[model samples]
Target chain A: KSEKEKMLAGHLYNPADLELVKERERARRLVRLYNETLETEYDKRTGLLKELFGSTGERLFIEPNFRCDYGYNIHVGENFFMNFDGVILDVCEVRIGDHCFIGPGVHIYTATHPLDPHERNSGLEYGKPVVIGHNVWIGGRAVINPGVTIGDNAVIASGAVVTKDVPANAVVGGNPAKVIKWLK
Target chain B: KSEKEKMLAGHLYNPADLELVKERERARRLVRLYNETLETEYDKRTGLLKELFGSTGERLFIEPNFRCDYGYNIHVGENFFMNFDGVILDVCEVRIGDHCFIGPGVHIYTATHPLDPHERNSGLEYGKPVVIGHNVWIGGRAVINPGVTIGDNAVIASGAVVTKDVPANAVVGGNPAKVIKWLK
Candidate 1:
């Protein structure tokens, strides 16, 4: 399998592969254009945002200084709103459902390195998919770790480091997030 | 009161006032310049950093993509070091003491909207100063909320949400950070 296929398959893949590097460079160029536009130039900014993502809803809005490893692995549903300086390392698929509100400086990282130092030093890395359910509101500076899923209507509190799955209609908070309250 | 006086006094003020808007615009412009500079341009970057802030130590260093609202409201002491993508929303004063280390993606916010939705929607807001004491080390992706004070020799863990005053020499972690251990 090609390196792209291997990456998406959740296997260790060489990030320095020519094809992958080109794709990342393409993303970086587009992101630079998006970030450099004046705030008054709304149309150009909106166009660049649409062009930079793999697939996105028509109504989605993202603030400036957004960063991602591979834009093609990220997909967003309708009515999504992302605030300033958010980072998503989408080594694998990162899916966000409808009506999601992401706060400022939130980070969603799907990439993980090997437990063995020798293997990690070899430069191969793997990733897991991260999925966020509909109507979720993730607060400022929160981090979503690899392979986690958030069920519909869940609320993740500000600065919470989410390390596991969150059930629907729940409120999770703290580092290695714990269920603080159940909405249902 | 003049809008500047009102803002400096830590009272509710209109952010849309012309002077405040201009100041914010100036900060944004300078931050854009800072973020766009190449890593090879060390001397140029240092000059820009000094020009961007109200006051900064001669030996301070900040990695690229640093941002602040009205940069003039921030003051840093000697030997300060901040990693990439650190943002300080210094609507009020943000004072950082000597030998502090700020990790990547850390957000220090002094700005807060009104608790009443009506007042919030009306565009009236206020801010409280944030103070970071000497020899503090804040881990990656932490959020220091409005009006918080981080004490001297304190260590804030990754993804911690600091909502109150931290004791000196304490190690704080988690959402709404608590003293996880004592260092002194």
Candidate 2:
């Protein structure tokens, strides 16, 4: 089935409610169902999640109510972890490096629109890849925008609205993410 | 002194109380503070805010509790309205047109870092402009990124992370903010 066309035709697509798509024993059941929903390769569901995410990767644990456009477009690396309500807007391609820890309500988006007013008014849009490097810890409600690249070992504090490229080993927070102070 | 360089010496920048900052009585006080802090024309602060912001154009209603690298780089039109905790990281420049209603915790930022691992680690960064057209409404907790332009009469839902440009007369929401439907 075409995921793009199906989503574009709908009002709202909720992936966190994966339990409705299948059966479940408990709240943690979505993890098992998700592994089955997309990549049905490995014998164990945890192994599939670990494999699908990246090598040396930690658990990419998402709490209930996790949402994504297509479950397949997102790629995460080793030791990756996210807290509750983590949402990924993987329109084009979202790539995360190894050992990255995303906080609760972290949002990574890769959807873009046009510059020209006329084209934008026509309901047409574009897509881009969003990249996050290794060992980066993002605070709660931190956001990464379309076509943005966040460097390795960077710390993004809670409520930091990241709109641009983040430097490696940088500590940033606030509405528009800025290099608040340099790391030693 | 250059606005950017002054911000680099941000150790001296002290943000006022959030509650009092948003009060109408505090508007005149803020104008005086910025005049002394940035050494800019308070005329822009008092006049432009009234011209560009929405019905609550008076400085008393809008409080700026955030920090930015350059104040001159920001261009806001008349009759603008921003709720509590609204921030603009104006590195390149932020131009918000008249009669725009920015919800509480709305962030419009313009900062980016380098991509190369070595360069990123060195703490170097860059930025771009964010433009919001006339009479637009950005919901609470919406994050707007660098180089993105939102058209006139656009409606962005609460908690929508806008990394891309939103067209005029459109309704967008979600992590990457796909178009829900167009408003006629």
Candidate 3:
């Protein structure tokens, strides 16, 4: 399989492959353009985001300095609002449902590296998809790690490091986040 | 005291104060210019950093998309390296000692809002200083909250949300980060 195929399949693959490098560079260029837009250039920003993401609803808005690894792997539903400095490492698919509000410096990562030092140092990496359900609010500086699935109406506290699945209507906080409260 | 004076003294102040707003805008412009520099433009990047910071020793490198409020409140010692997408909310003094290695997506926040909702809604905010001693290594996606101090040779783990002081040679991790290990 090609490195891209391996990457999408969640298998360890070389990120430095020529094709992958080119694709990453392409994404970076677009990201740079998007980040450099003026606050008054809303239309231009929207155009750039539409050109960059694979799919997005009409009402999606993201503040500047946003970044991603692969723009093609990200999909956001309606009324998605991402605040400043959000980074989505979309090495794999990152799917966000409707009315999702992500605060400043939120990082949704689909990228992963092996825990074994030797394997990690082999220049091989893998990824897993991240899924977020409707009406989820991710607070500022939160990190959604690889492969986590967050259910609907969940509130992720500021600075939360989420590593596990968050159930519907759950409010989670702390590192390797656990349920802090239930909305139901 | 003036709003700027109150801000520097870590007291509640209006960030929308005219002088403060203008200063923030100035910092943002410089930050944007610095972030837009090409990878090959090392001299340009260095020059901007020198111009932005309150004080800095020689040999400091920071990746693009670095954001800060009131750059004049930030000071770093020699041999400082910060990775991509680092945000330092330097509303108050942020002093970093020599040989610090800060990883990607790290957020050092000196800015903070009132805990009471009424006070917070009134638009009054305060700040506390963050101090990092020499040879400190802050890992990826780590958050150093307001008023925290870290001693020399400390290592902050990835995805850690540090909320308190760290002793020298400590390895801290997790939300409200606690000492995980200590180096002699």
Candidate 4:
């Protein structure tokens, strides 16, 4: 399979493939343009975001200084709001449901490197998809690691490092985040 | 006392004070320019960083997309390196010692808001200083909370939320990070 196909299939693939490199550069250019826009240039910002993401709702808004890899792998539902310095490493599909709020410096990553140093040094990497259900609120500086699925109406505390799946209507906090509260 | 004085003294202060606003704006402009520089423009980036920080060593380097408040409150020692998407909320003094390596998406914050909702809504906030000793390695997405002091040779694990002081030669991880290992 081609590198892109391998990547999309969640198999190990070389990120330095010429095609992948070109795609990443393209995404970077778009992201830079989006970030450089003035606060008042809402239309322009929206335009850029629309072009960058594979899919998005009409009411989605994001603050500047956002960074992502392979923008096309990201899909957001209606009324999505992401604050400043948000970084999404979308090496695989990242799907978010409606009315999701992502706080400042929140990182949603679908990218993962091999744990074995030798394999990592070989420059091959794999990815797993991240799925976030509706009405989810992720606090500032929180990290959503690869393959984790967050359920509906969940709240993630600030600075939380989420490694496992979070159940619906739950509040999670801390490193390797565990359920702190139940909203249901 | 003036808002600036109050801020420096770690007392509750208004961040919207005209002078403070102006300083933050100035810092934002400089940070924007620095973030926009091409990777090849090493000298330009270095020049901008030097102008933005209170003090820095000759060999300090940071990847683009860095954000900080009141850059002048920040001081770094020799051979400092920070990776991409770093954010430092330097409302109070933030000092880092020599040979410090900060990984990508690391956040070091010395700014905080009141826990009391009324006080928080009153537009007043307080801050505490953050200090890091020499040879400290902070992993990716780790957060150094306000007023935390990290000693020499400390290693902070990835996705750790550090909320307390760390002794020299300690390896800390997890939320409200605790010592996982000791280098000594």
DockQ score for candidate 4: 0.20
True contacts kept of each: 0.39, 0.00, 0.32, 0.32
lDDT of 4 at B5: 97
Highest-scoring model, lDDT:
4
Judged by DockQ cut-offs, the docking class of candidate 1 is acceptable
Candidate 2, residue A119: Cα displacement in angstroms equals 2.0
TM-score leaderboard ranking: 1, 3, 4, 2
Candidate 2, which segments miss by more than 4 Å at Cα? A1-58, A115-117, B1-152, B155-184
List the global CA lDDT of all models: 0.85, 0.60, 0.88, 0.89
Instruction: Give the TM-score of each candidate.
Output: 0.71, 0.43, 0.65, 0.65
Which window of ten consecutive residues has the lowest lDDT sum in model 4 chain B?
B114-123
Candidate 3 lDDT, A1-184, residue by residue in tens: 9999999999999999999999999999999999878654668988888888989999677778788997989999987778678899999999999877676799899999999999999999999999998878786799899999999878887798899999987889897789998777
| Per-residue alpha-carbon lDDT of candidate 1 for residues A1-184, written as tens digits (9 for 90 to 100) | 9988999999999999999999999989988888778755657876887787778887776768789987888899887777679999999999998877786888999999999999999999999999998878787788999999999878887788899999988889887789998877
TM-score of chain A, model number 1: 0.97
lDDT of 4 at A118: 100
Best by TM-score: 1
Per-residue lDDT of candidate 1, residues B41-90 (tens digit)? 88788888789888988777889878788999999999889999888988
Name the candidate that leads on DockQ: 1
State chain A's TM-score for model 4. 0.99
